[PDB]
């Protein structure tokens, strides 16, 4: 439990993909794809703006 | 500030391909024609397979690919046919389609080269190259084998895929003698000439000239059948044109309601 | 090693002669030189090959090992018996008997 | 209490991976072994055993 | 496992050509004079018919039916 | 004006370590008349240059004859009437250092100008009377011109 | 008579007669 | 490829856009120059070179090992006698702009695999899916619908990063929340 | 909502090694399936592109997200705190092309200025005055790679091949093979750009952009580079080939003979030793003073053979430039294609006598000599006969076994490591103690 | 399926090329790896150094 | 910035750099504290910063060597002590973990 | 699974402009024309085309990201010529030219057969 | 022997025949052990300033030291030796026609491709392998270049309109049962 349950986890909102090189991203840009995009969420609350 | 007066001297035509050189122009429009000759010159290719039965050893879909590879002789069709996604119809038309049919059944005991002498069209001017040399294998079947399709040709070009694309090889180049050093050769003698190199058996590239820009591009154009090689070239200047024109009605717009 | 009788022979410099076993050192020598040797071994452990690890990150490890007077290993028999409380103990080793 | 994987799937992914399963050897020596005199190519598998195919990962 | 349609590189159609350079092949030719005897130039087409191994031929042998 | 220096100089050595590039070469002129060095790296594709050549090599700190002082960027599109019309190597550079013989007390004699020109140097060591409109970090032309003679 | 540097097609020939004759996964 | 030079796609750019040489031979792939200098497969180049002259004089080249008769001077001879470069070097002009490229670039034809590491079989994401039963924390595997391990190495490496709250959020609040 | 342009992830490569393996990311979604970064960042991550994959998490809230993006974010994490130098450095293609592209001899119309100032982000819009007017404008390399350095920096650094009796002579400001890198105003006034002074050395270029500019500038010094270079690679191309590693066969007769001496005099040693003459070293045996005698000859042929085979390279060679750079190679592998490969080691000696007395049944029984113990004498040029094909075989395998024990011997190293320090942290008291609030350091670090 | 020609292997669903040699269980195709150990009835002489003995000879 | 040029004498005086490092080496506070064993620490924690401190901002070589002006030894002193404040470990810090 | 379709390089979208002019504000008379759908074929030759005006003083275009189909135009020119119309007449010209080209090369062709 | 064995199959000349003639011999390693062995057979045992000139053995090719996959690298002798092993292992994923019967089994995974080539450049044991009738991979015309920068660490750049017209075009298949 103490290993493997509670110091690490597995987690939701993670992905997992193969990595290629992209010369036109800044350095702190990531590119994702479509589908890993419209998978997982971020919940955003509502306000009058 | 104006525009260049670009002079054509075809070396050798046949009905394969083209030999030309175009003169006083600038390298990008020289360039720039020659990738208008790969993608965007429209050409008829089959892109629309319905299988009705499929006995062969190859696929369903390895025959819809071997199918759309298949050269068919556009030539005064394709510029009366509408794109299919413009046909103001539902289920392909006559006026934006041309339809083709396989039926081959294997009953004999030898084995059948389904080639494209059996894909019989609908209008007698689109057909695959057999006109005037074998022909593009399809299949073979066995004994009891069989394969029933129909299929359509739309009108389209490379640059959505390459079996919309009408050239064998583009063979441009410029400036043979490294005229502009635009290539550095670090031992420029063991370099073969090249075929329009108008220099002696002496000396191995020109001396080198300061002030000068490219012309005389020297093209070599080969059709793969489907266009005649000469009109490859004044399609790529239609096209290239006529993209032109259009981006400039969206310009006039764009300024006037600025 | 012996590092006692050596430092005692004469004609040896009872300054500068260094041991390699920090744990000869720590019987002879003390506590601080005991920081001082580690720090250098694990030094030119380290800058052997070229490269170059900060200061501070080495002077926190052998500060760590010598904090309480003798020397703790990095082992479960040095840091287990630290008096950190169970629930940190149980996560690095032995996880059950320490419970 | 047995060996294991003493026998395995057959590998038809391609005609050469085929080939070499059926042709493979293995030496029984456990994994977590920190030793490497048994993970070296000894002079002596010269035109027995191939010096080039090995895994590389811990087998 | 059949000889594909074009050339990869190039855009040249190759498919029309297997039989034809067999046949040459049976004839007596020697394999880069039976290579230009079919207009095969590029050495870009020249390897979809050296390379291209026909395997149709084998998966011909089993039958579905006689 | 802004002339900061003026004289004509004889190509005494050309690329003399050996040839470090291809389309750059060291040359080690002397003057004629003050009695200086040079050390100059042109672009010797260019304006290839020989042993033996001499040019006048006119160092300004403006183009316009009225020493109006322009900017430091490019518009090639102007009407004014020029230095470098004739001349037929320009250049435009930035001078990075200025050593000289001074001592701790007693002043300098002979000075050393480097200027870089885009990344192609240049000492003009001579004496510290020549050497005075250069200052560093300044913007300075180069206007050489092979006399035919 | 010996086989003198026509050796490599003799040295391929002995290994084809051994390979048609033992297949490859002879061993098992 | 056939000497140990892994890789993946990169990017595919359509025909008009592929560099090519003074007859319209585009390269199919084109590998980077340096990922031959450190690992010293000079194999790769030999048969790129091979290749060349196996396509031009129109039968199959032999590359057995230890073979005394094929060496480099000799493929160079031979791939001069077609008209090329000696070496392989070839005149290539860029597809975007038409310009030649200054350097000669060396093309040829090399034999390449296609290995079955696809990555449309390994693309796997997560947003609240199914849930182990005893620990009732995402399931593993990635046709399990499982969710990515947030191991503990992770997890030093956020103490160090001093980040308390994406730390207690990877660990407990998309893991496993209960009261 | 569905995640967007514009979030922050955390963006982490598995065996997670130090701080920068989990670096945070702006997310910017793209058309195939694959995460794409940029390559500067491969250096932290130690990825590779070649079936790599990382991991992507996602901050569920505002407190984290927040937290991620002023703590982890990318142009935050430039320099480690191990070694106090940055951890990204300029490392391919871009940095074999930044060398050439800086060096004294690259001149650029306007028709390639105006493109590749159009890769620009940080540039106003000024074209700047050409390095040469008349006869005809042309810019320079280094006067377009001063408008990619931001600010006004000031650093010098030395080229790779500076020599070194450089800074003795005259022309130490000016310098005659371009090395010696100078900006100032930030501006590059003389010198050429290697990995010495655009990797991640402490004190290199993007060292100083980043103690002096921002992160935030320093974001988009890194990215300007890559930009502008990777556009004039497209004008200047690279490429490596097989004339790349010939020699000029006066350079293979010095190597042959090199190597035919060395297996001379490592003949005489063996004649000494066998008739008894070869005294030993005070301090070793007399079969290890043979060793050494002879590992010594073996290891100046291969030296002096290499030298010889770099001192043969033209400027215009494909392994210099990537070995001068720095991007890629060092000049033991110009030697080992080029000259010879040397001799292979297992276990620190010589190739064992694994059959009795032998090393392979070809020799004959006690054959010390450098054939018959593993010295590779060919090239990777001109291969390796059968015997040293595989006494090559028996070397590299030796590299492949110790990968595989490293791997898990290392890493719990830094598990123990991490367990024994995990809570020592700096107190508001500004004092380093632990979870026992027991003082460890009065201040850190001393 | 031995000594079988060449048309009946494919006569009965075959591949002429496949080389034999793996079992089939349960619709599996299992291949026995060949394992290795040490030659019986031979004498060793060995020296373990980390035990009480000079020397050993196993057999 | 200042656009020095040593070539002409500066006006610095020399006396303005031997009080400006001396109120300098003050706003480096490492130890805060007016105890005895709190003035101890603090000049013990900065006692290679001050030397370095007080050897390259001399009298001499500020006057033969650097030639600053007045206004560009403001400057310089104000950024000091700026990039001294910025390297001073946060509180919060979690340095086993870095070391380790 | 994640390809896009291939004709999502010419076909315009519902809602996306062909083209979109931004006056640019570092320098004075400079505009940035925003092309959908296009790439080097057509903003090669308006750049090469656009250095022939000896009233510009820059020009040049780019291709932001290859994986997307759009490309940018920036002009500047003297202050007595706008760039909308620098970018006018680089294309009336280019088309003038090519129009000119394809007579040319019809003529010759038809010389060329039987002549 | 020579002349006898190539003309076998026409008669019935045979590998044993070899044997029982007293030609080749099967040494092991045990016995290998007091063989002096020659590696070429002309080269070795030729007369200069002398080696042994008691050889017992001679080599038939030196290069039946390789197994099946390390054997079907084209040079291996101009390639660092962890390339080769890489090879080895890459080259046992490579996708191709994998059996010809592949109709009929019902496979779990199998991946085909749709036009494998042989390669252009062989060696000359991949014969007996069977490797030019089940082949795995095309012979590509690759273009050693460093293009736009999108090929730059391992990665490649592959040609979209080769794809299109079925380069490298595989096809995988699963299969399911129940009862
Ligand atoms: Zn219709
Ligand atoms: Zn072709």
């Given at each position: 439990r103490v290993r493997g349950n509670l110091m690490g986890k597995r987690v939701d909102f993670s992905a997992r993909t193969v990595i290629t090189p992209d010369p036109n991203l800044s350095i702190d840009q990531v590119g994702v794809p479509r589908s890993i995009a419209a998978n997982m969420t971020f919940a955003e609350i509502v306000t009058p703006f | 500030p104006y525009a260049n007066q670009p002079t054509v001297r075809i070396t050798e035509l046949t009905d394969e391909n083209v030999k030309f050189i175009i003169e006083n122009t600038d390298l990008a429009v020289a360039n720039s024609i020659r990738r208008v000759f790969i993608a965007e010159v429209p050409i008829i290719a089959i892109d629309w397979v319905q299988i009705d039965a499929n006995s062969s050893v190859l696929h369903d879909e390895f025959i819809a690919h071997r199918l759309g590879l298949?050269?068919?002789?556009?030539?005064?069709?394709?510029?009366?046919?509408?794109?299919?996604?413009?046909?103001?119809?539902?289920?392909?038309?006559?006026?934006?389609?041309?339809?083709?049919?396989?039926?081959?059944?294997?009953?004999?005991?030898?084995?059948?080269?389904?080639?494209?002498?059996?894909?019989?069209?609908?209008?007698?001017?689109?057909?695959?190259?057999?006109?005037?040399?074998?022909?593009?294998?399809?299949?073979?079947?066995?004994?009891?084998?069989?394969?029933?399709?129909?299929?359509?040709?739309?009108?389209?070009?490379?640059?959505?895929?390459?079996?919309?694309?009408?050239?064998?090889?583009?063979?441009?180049?410029?400036?043979?003698?490294?005229?502009?050093?635009?290539?550095?050769?670090?031992?420029?003698?063991?370099?073969?000439?090249?075929?329009?190199?108008?220099?002696?058996?002496?000396?191995?590239?020109?001396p080198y000239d300061p002030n000068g820009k490219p012309e005389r591009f020297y093209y070599n154009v080969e059709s793969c059948g489907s266009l005649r090689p000469e009109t490859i070239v004044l399609s790529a200047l239609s096209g290239l044109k006529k993209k032109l024109s259009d981006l400039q009605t969206q310009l006039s717009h764009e300024i006037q309601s600025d | 090693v012996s590092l006692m009788r050596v430092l005692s022979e004469k004609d040896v410099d009872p300054v500068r002669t260094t041991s390699n076993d920090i744990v000869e050192i720590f019987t002879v020598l003390g506590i601080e030189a005991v920081r001082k040797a580690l720090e250098r071994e694990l030094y030119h452990v380290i800058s052997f090959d070229g490269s170059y690890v900060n200061y501070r990150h080495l002077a926190l490890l052998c500060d760590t090992m010598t904090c309480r007077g003798h020397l703790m290993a990095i082992t479960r028999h040095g840091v287990n018996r630290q008096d950190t409380g169970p629930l940190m103990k149980c996560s690095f080793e032995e996880t059950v008997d320490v419970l | 209490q047995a060996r294991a994987g003493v026998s395995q799937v057959l590998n038809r992914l391609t005609f050469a991976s085929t080939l070499s399963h059926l042709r493979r050897l293995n030496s029984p020596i456990g994994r977590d072994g920190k030793l490497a005199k048994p993970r070296q190519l000894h002079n002596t598998l010269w035109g027995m055993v191939c010096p080039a195919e090995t895994p590389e990962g811990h087998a | 496992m059949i000889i594909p349609v074009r050339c990869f590189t190039c855009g040249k159609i190759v498919g029309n050509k297997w039989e034809a350079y067999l046949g040459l092949l049976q004839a007596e030719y020697t394999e880069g004079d039976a290579l230009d005897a079919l207009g095969l130039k590029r050495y870009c087409c020249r390897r979809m018919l050296l390379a291209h191994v026909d395997l149709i031929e084998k998966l011909l042998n089993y039958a579905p039916l006689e | 004006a802004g002339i900061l220096f003026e004289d004509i100089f004889d190509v005494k050595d050309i690329d003399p370590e050996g040839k470090k590039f291809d389309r750059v070469s060291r040359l080690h002129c002397e003057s004629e008349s003050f009695k200086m060095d040079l050390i100059l790296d042109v672009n010797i594709q260019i304006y290839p240059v020989d042993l033996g050549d001499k040019f006048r090599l006119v160092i300004a700190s403006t183009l316009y004859e009225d020493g109006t002082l322009d900017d430091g960027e490019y518009n090639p599109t102007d009407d004014r009437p020029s230095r470098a019309d004739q001349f037929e190597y320009v250049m435009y550079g930035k001078v990075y250092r200025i050593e000289g013989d001074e001592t701790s007390t007693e002043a300098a004699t002979r000075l050393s100008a480097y200027v870089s020109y885009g990344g192609l140097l240049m000492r003009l060591q001579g004496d510290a009377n020549n050497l005075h409109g250069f200052e560093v970090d300044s913007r300075v032309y180069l206007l050489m011109k092979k006399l035919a003679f | 008579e010996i086989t003198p540097d026509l050796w490599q097609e003799a040295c391929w020939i002995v290994i084809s007669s051994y390979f048609d004759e033992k297949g490859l996964v002879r061993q098992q | 490829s056939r000497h140990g030079q892994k890789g993946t796609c990169g990017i595919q750019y359509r025909q008009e856009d592929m560099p090519f040489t003074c007859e319209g031979i585009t390269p199919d792939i084109i590998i980077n120059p340096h990922a031959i200098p450190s690992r010293m497969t000079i194999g790769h180049l030999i048969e790129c070179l091979q290749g060349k002259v196996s396509a031009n004089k129109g039968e199959i080249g032999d590359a057995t090992p230890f073979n005394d008769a094929v060496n480099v001077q000799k493929i160079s001879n031979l791939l001069s006698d077609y008209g090329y470069h000696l070496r392989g070097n070839e005149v290539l002009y860029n597809g975007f702009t038409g310009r030649k490229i200054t350097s000669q670039i060396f093309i040829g034809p090399t034999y390449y695999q296609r290995l079955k590491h696809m990555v449309d079989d390994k693309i796997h994401s997560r947003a609240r899916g199914p849930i182990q039963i005893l620990n009732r924390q995402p399931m593993e595997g990635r046709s399990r619908d499982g969710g990515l391990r947030f191991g503990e190495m992770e997890r030093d490496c956020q103490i160090a990063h001093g980040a308390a709250q994406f730390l207690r959020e990877r660990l407990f609040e998309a893991s496993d929340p209960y009261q | 909502?569905?995640?967007?342009?514009?979030?922050?992830?955390?963006?982490?490569?598995?065996?997670?090694?130090?701080?920068?393996?989990?670096?945070?990311?702006?997310?910017?979604?793209?058309?195939?399936?694959?995460?794409?970064?940029?390559?500067?960042?491969?250096?932290?991550?130690?990825?590779?592109?070649?079936?790599?994959?990382?991991?992507?998490?996602?901050?569920?809230?505002?407190?984290?997200?927040?937290?991620?993006?002023?703590?982890?974010?990318?142009?935050?994490?430039?320099?480690?705190?191990?070694?106090?130098?940055?951890?990204?450095?300029?490392?391919?293609?871009?940095?074999?092309?930044?060398?050439?592209?800086?060096?004294?001899?690259?001149?650029?119309?306007?028709?390639?200025?105006?493109?590749?100032?159009?890769?620009?982000?940080?540039?106003?819009?000024?074209?700047?005055?050409?390095?040469?007017?008349?006869?005809?404008?042309?810019?320079?390399?280094?006067?377009?790679?001063?408008?990619?350095?931001?600010?006004?920096?000031?650093?010098?650094?030395?080229?790779?091949?500076?020599?070194?009796?450089?800074?003795?002579?005259?022309?130490?400001?000016?310098?005659?093979?371009?090395?010696?890198?100078?900006?100032?105003?930030?501006?590059?006034?003389?010198?050429?750009?290697?990995?010495?002074?655009?990797?991640?050395?402490?004190?290199?270029?993007?060292?100083?952009?980043?103690?002096?500019?921002?992160?935030?500038?320093?974001?988009?010094?890194?990215?300007?580079?890559?930009?502008?270079?990777?556009?004039?690679?497209?004008?200047?191309?690279?490429?490596?080939?097989?004339?790349?590693?010939?020699?000029?066969?006066?350079?293979?007769?010095?190597?042959?003979?090199?190597?035919?001496?060395?297996?001379?005099?490592?003949?005489?040693?063996?004649?000494?030793?066998?008739?008894?003459?070869?005294?030993?070293?005070?301090?070793?045996?007399?079969?290890?003073?043979?060793?050494?005698?002879?590992?010594?000859?073996?290891?100046?042929?291969?030296?002096?053979?290499?030298?010889?085979?770099?001192?043969?390279?033209?400027?215009?060679?494909?392994?210099?430039?990537?070995?001068?750079?720095?991007?890629?190679?060092?000049?033991?592998?110009?030697?080992?294609?080029?000259?010879?490969?040397?001799?292979?080691?297992?276990?620190?000696?010589?190739?064992?006598?694994?059959?009795?007395?032998?090393?392979?049944?070809?020799?004959?029984?006690?054959?010390?000599?450098?054939?018959?113990?593993?010295?590779?004498?060919?090239?990777?040029?001109?291969?390796?006969?059968?015997?040293?094909?595989?006494?090559?075989?028996?070397?590299?395998?030796?590299?492949?076994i110790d990968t595989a024990v490293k791997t898990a011997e290392t890493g719990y190293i830094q598990r123990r490591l991490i367990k024994s320090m995990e809570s020592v942290m700096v107190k508001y008291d500004a004092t380093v103690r632990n979870s026992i609030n027991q003082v460890v350091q009065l201040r850190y670090g001393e | 399926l031995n000594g079988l020609t060449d048309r009946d292997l494919c006569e009965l669903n075959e591949c002429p090329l496949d080389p034999g040699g793996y079992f089939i269980i349960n619709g599996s195709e299992k291949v026995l790896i060949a394992q290795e150990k040490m030659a019986t009835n031979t004498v060793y002489v060995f020296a373990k150094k980390d035990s009480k003995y000079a020397y050993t000879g196993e057999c | 910035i200042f656009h020095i040029n040593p070539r002409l004498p500066s006006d610095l005086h020399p006396i303005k750099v031997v009080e400006g490092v001396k109120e300098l080496s003050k706003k480096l506070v490492i130890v805060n504290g007016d105890d005895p064993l709190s003035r101890q620490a603090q000049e013990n924690a900065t006692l290679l910063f001050n030397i370095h401190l007080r050897s390259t901002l001399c009298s001499r070589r500020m006057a033969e060597e650097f030639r600053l002006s007045g206004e560009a030894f403001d400057w310089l002193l104000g950024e000091i002590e700026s990039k001294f404040n910025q390297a001073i470990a946060h509180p919060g810090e979690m340095v086993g973990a870095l070391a380790a | 699974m994640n390809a896009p379709p291939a004709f999502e390089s010419f076909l315009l979208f519902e809602g996306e402009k062909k083209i979109t002019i931004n006056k640019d504000t570092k320098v004075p008379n400079a505009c940035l024309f925003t092309i959908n759908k296009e790439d080097h074929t057509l903003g090669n030759i308006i750049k090469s085309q656009l250095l022939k005006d000896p009233q510009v003083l820059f020009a040049g275009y780019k291709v932001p990201h290859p994986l997307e189909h759009k490309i940018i135009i920036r002009v500047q020119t003297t202050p007595d010529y706008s760039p909308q119309e620098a970018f006018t007449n680089a294309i009336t010209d280019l088309i003038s030219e090519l129009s000119l080209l394809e007579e040319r090369f019809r003529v010759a062709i038809k010389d060329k057969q039987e002549g | 022997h020579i002349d006898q064995l190539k003309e076998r199959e026409y008669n019935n000349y045979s590998w044993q025949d070899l044997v029982a003639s007293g030609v080749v011999e099967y040494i092991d390693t045990l016995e290998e052990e007091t063989v002096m062995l020659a590696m070429t057979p002309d080269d070795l045992q030729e007369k200069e300033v002398a080696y042994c000139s008691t050889y017992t053995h001679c080599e038939i090719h030196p290069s039946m030291i390789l197994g099946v996959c390390a054997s079907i690298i084209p040079f291996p002798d101009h390639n660092q030796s962890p390339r080769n092993t890489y090879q080895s292992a890459m080259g046992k994923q490579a996708m191709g026609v994998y059996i010809t019967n592949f109709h009929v089994r019902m496979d779990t995974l199998a991946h085909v491709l749709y036009y494998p080539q042989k390669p252009l450049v062989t060696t000359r044991s991949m014969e007996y392998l069977r490797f030019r009738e089940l082949p795995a991979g095309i012979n590509s015309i690759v273009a050693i270049a460093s293009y736009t920068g999108y090929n730059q660490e391992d990665s490649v750049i592959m040609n979209r309109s080769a794809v299109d017209r079925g380069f490298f075009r595989s096809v995988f298949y699963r299969s399911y049962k129940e009862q």
């Open positions: - | 298949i050269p068919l002789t556009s030539d005064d069709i394709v510029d009366k046919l509408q794109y299919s996604r413009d046909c103001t119809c539902e289920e392909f038309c006559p006026e934006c389609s041309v339809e083709f049919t396989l039926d081959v059944r294997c009953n004999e005991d030898q084995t059948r080269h389904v080639t494209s002498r059996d894909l019989i069209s609908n209008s007698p001017r689109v057909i695959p190259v057999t006109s005037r040399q074998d022909d593009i294998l399809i299949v073979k079947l066995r004994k009891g084998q069989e394969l029933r399709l129909r299929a359509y040709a739309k009108k389209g070009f490379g640059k959505e895929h390459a079996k919309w694309n009408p050239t064998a090889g583009v063979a441009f180049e410029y400036d043979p003698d490294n005229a502009l050093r635009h290539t550095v050769y670090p031992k420029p003698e063991e370099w073969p000439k090249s075929e329009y190199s108008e220099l002696d058996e002496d000396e191995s590239q020109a | - | - | - | - | - | - | 909502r569905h995640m967007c342009d514009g979030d922050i992830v955390i963006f982490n490569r598995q065996p997670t090694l130090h701080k920068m393996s989990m670096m945070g990311h702006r997310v910017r979604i793209l058309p195939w399936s694959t995460f794409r970064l940029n390559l500067s960042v491969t250096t932290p991550y130690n990825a590779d592109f070649d079936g790599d994959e990382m991991n992507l998490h996602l901050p569920q809230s505002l407190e984290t997200r927040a937290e991620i993006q002023e703590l982890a974010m990318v142009p935050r994490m430039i320099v480690t705190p191990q070694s106090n130098r940055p951890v990204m450095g300029i490392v391919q293609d871009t940095l074999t092309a930044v060398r050439k592209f800086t060096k004294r001899d690259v001149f650029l119309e306007r028709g390639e200025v105006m493109n590749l100032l159009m890769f620009l982000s940080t540039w106003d819009g000024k074209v700047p005055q050409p390095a040469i007017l008349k006869p005809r404008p042309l810019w320079t390399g280094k006067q377009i790679f001063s408008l990619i350095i931001p600010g006004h920096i000031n650093c010098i650094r030395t080229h790779s091949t500076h020599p070194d009796d450089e800074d003795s002579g005259p022309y130490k400001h000016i310098s005659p093979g371009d090395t010696k890198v100078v900006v100032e105003n930030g501006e590059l006034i003389m010198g050429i750009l290697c990995k010495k002074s655009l990797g991640t050395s402490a004190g290199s270029l993007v060292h100083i952009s980043y103690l002096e500019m921002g992160h935030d500038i320093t974001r988009l010094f890194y990215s300007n580079i890559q930009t502008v270079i990777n556009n004039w690679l497209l004008i200047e191309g690279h490429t490596i080939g097989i004339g790349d590693s010939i020699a000029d066969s006066k350079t293979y007769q010095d190597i042959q003979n090199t190597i035919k001496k060395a297996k001379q005099d490592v003949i005489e040693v063996i004649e000494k030793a066998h008739n008894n003459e070869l005294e030993p070293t005070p301090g070793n045996t007399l079969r290890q003073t043979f060793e050494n005698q002879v590992n010594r000859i073996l290891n100046d042929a291969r030296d002096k053979t290499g030298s010889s085979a770099q001192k043969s390279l033209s400027e215009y060679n494909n392994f210099k430039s990537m070995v001068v750079s720095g991007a890629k190679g060092s000049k033991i592998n110009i030697s080992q294609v080029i000259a010879v490969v040397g001799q292979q080691n297992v276990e620190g000696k010589r190739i064992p006598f694994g059959f009795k007395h032998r090393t392979l049944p070809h020799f004959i029984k006690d054959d010390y000599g450098p054939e018959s113990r593993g010295f590779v004498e060919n090239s990777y040029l001109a291969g390796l006969t059968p015997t040293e094909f595989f006494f090559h075989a028996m070397g590299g395998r030796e590299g492949l | - | - | - | -």
